[PDB]
Amino acid sequence: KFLSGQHSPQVGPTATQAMQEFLTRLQVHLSSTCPQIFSEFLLKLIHILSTERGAFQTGQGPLDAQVKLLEFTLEQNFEVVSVSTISAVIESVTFLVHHYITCSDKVMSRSGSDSSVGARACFGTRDQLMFDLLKLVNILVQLPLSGNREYSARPAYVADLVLANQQIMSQILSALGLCNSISVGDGLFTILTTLSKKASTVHMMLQPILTYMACGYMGRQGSLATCQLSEPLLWFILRVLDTSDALKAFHDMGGVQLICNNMVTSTRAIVNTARSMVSTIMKFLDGIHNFAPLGTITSSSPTAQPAEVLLQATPPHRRARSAAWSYIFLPEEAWCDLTIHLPAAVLLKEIHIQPHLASLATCPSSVSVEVSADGVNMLPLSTPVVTSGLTYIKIQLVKAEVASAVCLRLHRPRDASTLGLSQIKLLGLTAFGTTSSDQVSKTSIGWLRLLHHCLTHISDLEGMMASAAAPTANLLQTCAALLMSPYCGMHSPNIEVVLVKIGLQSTRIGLKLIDILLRNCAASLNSPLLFGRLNGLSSDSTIDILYQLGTTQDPGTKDRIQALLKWVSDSARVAAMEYGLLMPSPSHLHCVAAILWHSYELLVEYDLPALLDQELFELLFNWSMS
């Protein structure tokens, strides 16, 4: 009741200090005789508060007092605490934090003083509470278990129960997947790191990861459903896959096939948002940019002062004695509205409203932002933002929204009948033009980064991984597509390593890989297509790969060289008269020549001259003279 709760929800330092004083005295008196009941009481207390419709889940009660309780709990010793309550709090707390991250608000408005890091941000208010809960979970999972696994001891750990709990693991991993590159994401990442360290066996840690990677959103199945990856989660997986034993175990459980299957599938399931030659053509036909000046601002109240002065790009001087725009509230009016119509839809990212700094009493107490992508049907973005006492109103959309109109509903000031505003900015982007200024989460590259790490991290195992990765259908076609795509969080050289190591692990895929690079790279409504790329296009990456295939010494070398020469003859023959044959890359032809030259000077172990028959030579002469 105490922690569950116009007054502020806080209780103030004195009441909050009393609760800490109360809890501290309990702890001291119980320390020398029976501290386990106090910790159980705290965890039972925290569990009750965290359960659905509990204080934490509903955001009720004194936040300062709740955080102080959470801060107090983090300093307690949880030895000899029953495993039932620990699992209850971890389940409840992880569910709560997963709920918090999934239920994050659509808009974001902080004061200029606030400089905290958002929950969805790694490797750097309710956020502090959620982070405080996550710190608690980390402390609990590190507790050694007693002999019978019913109480904390004082070499198994609660992590095993957590890892053995599929629902708990799904929540944590799915929760971390909604984070992006100390905040809540750090807490999830630290907990997951803690789970891996304390896992009894590498299989215990890998199974939840593999289970998550084997399903889609909320454990769904389906052909094109794949799990959400993020840089923190991907970074964690790589740390999990850091050892040879873990990599061997990952391979043994179908992990390599899984990630390779996911890459093919996920690559089918994504459209490249990177700008392409269509965007360039728009540019040829002639950080965010303020579109408010271009818009027209109106109000539903017939008696409102015209607010166009608010849209002007140049704000008035901060000590101007008269608000650029003022609204006189009727005694029964709580909200005034300002509709900004833009000439065309823009990707709105922020809305800045400047209250009259000289008379802050007329600043609206709260602002309700509605956004209309079509500019006709307004839809509230979120609940009104409390704005009283703000010299500057910065409303950041966490997810940029297409908006052709923005309706600001400003609440009557607490202590004034007039609302005074200086400027309104609508910051954003256009579809194209000069004003159009986590890749792992939005592309399939995360799977390739996982695949590259598996192939390269431990050389002695490389072969096995390639053998497990080569069979999957359309893997090479997809990797070629990622090779020829604009940088999307993975540098081309790493993609080259994957393609080279896959193509070299057996002759059959080398012929397929050569054909993909030179002849036909397309996939062999759910099937992968990879129709987007021209056949036979050459780059620094493709040229290097072809050279690496040609000059690598192994049993298949001969066959690969044959294929190259075959493509040459085919190309020449086609020239004398499938796209790769019609438009042979000059760079690749020189690459074939360099392969031949360097093979001659390397003293290869196959009969290179026998492959160079006179008929092929005559073909080249006829071609060049043509």
Partner 1 sequence: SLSSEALMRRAVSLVTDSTSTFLSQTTYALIEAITEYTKAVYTLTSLYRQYTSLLGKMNSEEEDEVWQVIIGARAEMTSKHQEYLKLETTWMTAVGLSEMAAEAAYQTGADQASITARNHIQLVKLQVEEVHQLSRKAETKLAEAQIEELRQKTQEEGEERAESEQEAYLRED
Partner 2 sequence: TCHADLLLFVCKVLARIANATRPTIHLCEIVNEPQLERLLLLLVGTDFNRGDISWGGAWAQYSLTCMLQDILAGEL
Partner 3 sequence: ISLNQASITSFLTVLAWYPNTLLRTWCLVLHSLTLMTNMQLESTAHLLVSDPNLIHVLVKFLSGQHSPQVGPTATQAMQEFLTRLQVHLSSTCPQIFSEFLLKLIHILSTERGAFQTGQGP
Q: In Å, what is the CA distance from 75 to each residue of 23, 39, 42, 466?
A: 12, 10, 11, 48
Site residues (CB under 8 A) for partner 1?
316-322
Among positions 1, 33, 112, 148, the unique one binding its own copies when judged by CB under 8 A: 112
Among positions 15, 182, 274, 361, the unique one binding partner 2 when judged by CB under 8 A: 274
Look at the block and give the residue holding tokens 């509709």.
339
553: partner contacted, choices partner 3, its own copies, partner 1, none (Cβ within 5-8 A by kind): none
Among positions 21, 105, 245, 540, the unique one binding partner 3 when judged by CB under 8 A: 105
| 524 sits near partner 2 (criterion: CB under 8 A) | no
Which of 335, 606 has the CB closer to its own copies? Answer: 335
| Whole-angstrom distance, CA of residue 112 vs CA of residue 431 | 30
Which of 413, 550 has the CB closer to its own copies? Answer: 413
DSSP state of 355: E
| 444 sits near partner 2 (criterion: CB under 8 A) | no
* Surface-to-core class of residue 176, CB atoms within 10 Å of its CB (0-12 exposed, 13-18 middle, 19+ buried): buried
Helix or strand (DSSP H, E) at 250: helix 244-252
| 383 sits near partner 3 (criterion: CB under 8 A) | yes
| 363 sits near its own copies (criterion: CB under 8 A) | yes
| 13 sits near its own copies (criterion: CB under 8 A) | yes
| 380 sits near partner 3 (criterion: CB under 8 A) | yes
Among positions 381, 405, 466, 483, the unique one binding partner 3 when judged by CB under 8 A: 381
Which listed range, 407-415, 557-565, 576-584, 593-601, lies at the site for its own copies (CB under 8 A)?
Answer: 407-415
Which DSSP string corresponds to 90-139? HHHHHHHHHHHHHT--SEE---SS--PPPSS-----HHHHHHHHHHHHHH
Give exposure, 293-305, as e/b (b: 16+ Cβ within 10 Å). Answer: ebbebbbeeeebb
Which listed range, 13-21, 80-88, 89-97, 551-559, lies at the site for its own copies (CB under 8 A)?
Answer: 13-21
Do 158 and 83 form a contact (C-beta atoms < 8 A)?
A: yes
| 372 sits near partner 3 (criterion: CB under 8 A) | no
| Whole-angstrom distance, CA of residue 68 vs CA of residue 62 | 10
CB of 319 to partner 1, least distance (A): 5
Among positions 113, 221, 526, 626, the unique one binding its own copies when judged by CB under 8 A: 113
Three-point CA angle 79, 83, 89, nearest 5°: 95
Among positions 34, 431, 582, 602, the unique one binding partner 2 when judged by CB under 8 A: 431
| 251 sits near partner 3 (criterion: CB under 8 A) | no
Which of 98, 409 has the CB closer to its own copies? Answer: 409
532: tokens are 């987007």
Contacting its own copies within 119-148 (CB under 8 A): none
258: tokens are 């899984």
Using CB under 8 A as the binding criterion, the count of chain residues that bind partner 2 stands at 42
- Comparing CA positions, the residue from 470, 497, 482, 484 lying closest to residue 535 is 484
594: partner contacted, choices partner 1, partner 3, partner 2, none (Cβ within 5-8 A by kind): none
| Whole-angstrom distance, CA of residue 439 vs CA of residue 458 | 25
| Residues 6+ away with beta carbon under 8 Å from 596 | 608, 612
Which of 246, 499 has the CB closer to partner 2? Answer: 499
Q: How far is CA 243 from the centre of its chain?
A: 25
Contacting partner 2 within 170-229 (CB under 8 A): 178, 216-218, 220, 222, 224-226, 228
Site residues (vs partner 3, CB under 8 A): 4-5, 53, 58, 60, 99, 102-103, 105-106, 109, 335, 365-366, 368, 370, 378-386, 409, 411
Site residues (vs its own copies, CB under 8 A): 6-15, 62, 111-113, 335, 357, 359-361, 363, 365-366, 368, 370, 378-380, 382-386, 388-392, 409, 411-417
